[PDB]
Write a protein that binds this DNA or RNA. Structure first.
Lengths: 377, 144
RNA sequence: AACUGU
RNA sequence: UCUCCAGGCAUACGCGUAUAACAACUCGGAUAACCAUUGUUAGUUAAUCAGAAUAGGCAAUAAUCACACUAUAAAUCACCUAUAACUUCUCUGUUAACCCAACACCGGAAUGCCUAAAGGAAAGAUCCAAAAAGAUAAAAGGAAAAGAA
């Protein structure tokens, strides 16, 4: 009858094991937080210097670097898988706003450079509004959906660790902090989770990108500010899920300038980097709203889709979130990984002369129609 | 009857506690002569607690408090205590070592746990009986 | 007045 | 690894290489270990962080979760009408344990976030002198507790 005490490190010692034991005590308290809001506050109450991640960035292989920070595998192509007169939607998609850009009179921009960019925003907003109404009868989900215009989505995640090279804290171990802030042109928020495109724990031979150099070597800077995880709306909003996300690439990153800059190959990278960053951050926030965090991985896969357009070409991306444990401690033994499916950007039309649109491609619209018609089972 | 060490009486216990824990793990520790003598008494008394038995609640409480590392508690009852069951005392051996060349010239001594598997220390050897003086005394012994 | 090595 | 202590991280300002690695052990640290010293070499990466046209016409009604509601200390360019210009990402800031006090001075030093997950060590060794200082304990007694004027 020997009551041997557990063979564990002393809590009050100044050592790695003792510090780890103290860390566990705090992490136990996080597990003991009843409300989801309390969990977010505890995780973000302390502000520390962290990498600032831009969803749209010109860095080479930024999508690959983002995947390494996110643990996302990007498979090329779309994810594995009521008549409406597709021809009627070829025009009900409102070439009328393409007709209105020639009719609707508005005060000329002073800059003279934003004229092109302003035109693209007007058409996209009008097209989105009409499409939601046109597709509402077929898919009841669209009726209950919430449409967000140029609102911010934020996610804060930790992956990896680093050793301080110098200073008063030289040699101390600190985690690599990342923050993603995105403002999608449009996104749709629904109260019900979308249907999964593949069962959770799905495994493929492809491997996540690995980065040899430090994040700072690629242009990236750390700053200390509030840590935020946002789905595009507060937790009080009933629509804690979403249907689709819409993005518009700026003129600087458009194909013509990139080809002149010799970064023609990076056109797809810009599409991928924005899609992965926007969808992962947006998907991650949704899971946190459900109470799933790093030490409590999601029990159900979280899926989302987003479309990125350069003003003429349109690309479709689908993301599935499988792991919320991305920290070295939380991801120490995790077999699950995040999966992203993307498609190449395709033109939606050719030109708009006179007062009509010529060269409109229904195939891209069909993907939008096919995407919009999808609903949870 | 007690040396003044550390910053306070509790520190002495903690300092003694740390020294006792270190000795058990390694079985041979080098420290200042004054400190080594102070900790020698505690080490011998602890072995008596180990001999008392594992099931003894007081021994378990004493072992837990004195030994910070809990892996040592099985060792005391299954290594240290069984080893010295035959012996009635003198469990610890303390010997003088040349003073430290650390600019303070403190008195240095080595305290070791007897019966250990460590290499034998260079202990002093008494004069052999073959010496002329010893032989003469032996002759006196034989005559008597 | 109490309080206390005043 | 253990014992114990509990203002930490960013920016501003100032400082200006004190940063990091190597090599030295003479000088600097009011002693060593080790460097903050000596010599040599390296360093801080930004379209997102920070810094670096003109002439007329015309404006009554604070804020305080701004609604009610009052008050007194009385508290916010725009937009129109004409003229002029017509395709753009360079330059500069980014190191540090750092500053002002003759000093590696127990002093002074703004803001934001947070309160330990961050950040730290009172023991150069021995002795247990007197005397002195600080802290703790008081048998009986109470000027030889927090109550009144």
């Amino acid at each position: 009858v020997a009551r041997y005490p557990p063979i564990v490190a002393s809590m009050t010692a100044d050592s790695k094991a003792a510090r780890q034991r103290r860390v566990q005590r705090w992490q136990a308290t996080v597990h003991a937080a009843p409300s989801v809001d309390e969990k977010i506050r505890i995780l973000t109450k302390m502000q520390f210097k962290k990498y600032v991640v831009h969803p749209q960035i010109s860095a080479l292989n930024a999508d690959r670097w983002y995947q390494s920070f996110t643990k996302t595998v990007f498979v090329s192509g779309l994810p594995p898988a009521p008549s409406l007169d597709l021809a009627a939607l070829r025009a009900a998609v409102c070439d009328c706003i393409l007709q209105e850009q020639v009719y609707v009179r508005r005060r000329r921009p002073r800059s003279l450079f934003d004229r092109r960019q302003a035109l693209a925003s007007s058409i996209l907003d009008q097209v989105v509004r009409t499409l939601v109404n046109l597709l509402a009868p077929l898919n009841p989900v669209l009726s209950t959906a919430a449409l967000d215009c140029k609102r911010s989505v934020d996610f804060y995640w930790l992956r990896g660790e680093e050793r301080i090279p110098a200073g008063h804290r030289k040699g101390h171990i600190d985690a690599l902090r990342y923050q993603i802030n995105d403002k999608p042109h449009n996104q749709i928020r629904i109260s019900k989770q979308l249907p999964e495109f593949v069962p959770l724990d799905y495994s493929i031979p492809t491997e996540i990108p690995v980065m040899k150099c430090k994040p700072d070597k690629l242009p990236l800077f750390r700053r200390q500010y509030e840590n935020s995880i946002f789905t595009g709306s507060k937790t009080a909003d009933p629509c804690c899920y979403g249907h689709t996300q819409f993005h518009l690439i700026p003129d600087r990153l458009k194909r013509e300038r990139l080809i002149r800059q010799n970064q023609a190959e990076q056109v797809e990278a810009v599409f991928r980097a924005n899609a992965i960053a926007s969808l992962f951050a947006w998907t991650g926030a949704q899971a946190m709203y459900q109470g799933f965090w790093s030490e409590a991985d999601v029990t159900r896969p979280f899926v989302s889709q987003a479309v990125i357009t350069d003003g003429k070409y349109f690309s479709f991306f689908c993301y599935q979130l499988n792991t919320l444990a991305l920290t070295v401690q939380a991801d120490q033994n995790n077999p699950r990984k995040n999966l992203c499916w993307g498609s190449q950007s395709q033109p939606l039309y050719e030109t708009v002369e006179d007062n009509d649109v010529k060269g409109f491609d229904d195939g891209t619209l069909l993907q939008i129609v096919h995407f919009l018609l999808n609903k949870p089972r | 009857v007690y040396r003044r060490l550390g910053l306070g009486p509790e520190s002495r216990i903690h300092l003694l506690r740390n020294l006792l824990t270190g000795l058990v793990r390694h079985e041979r520790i080098e420290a200042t002569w004054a400190r080594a003598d102070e900790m020698r008494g505690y080490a011998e008394k602890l072995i008596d607690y180990g001999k008392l038995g594992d099931t003894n609640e007081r021994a378990m409480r004493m072992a837990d408090f004195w030994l910070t590392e809990k892996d040592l508690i099985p060792k005391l009852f299954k290594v240290l205590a069984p080893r010295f069951q035959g012996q009635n005392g003198n469990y610890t051996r303390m010997l003088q070592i040349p003073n430290r060349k650390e600019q303070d010239r403190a008195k240095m001594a080595v305290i070791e746990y007897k019966g250990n598997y460590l290499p034998p220390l260079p202990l002093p050897h008494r004069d052999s009986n073959l010496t002329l003086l010893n032989q003469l005394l032996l002759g006196l012994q034989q005559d008597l």
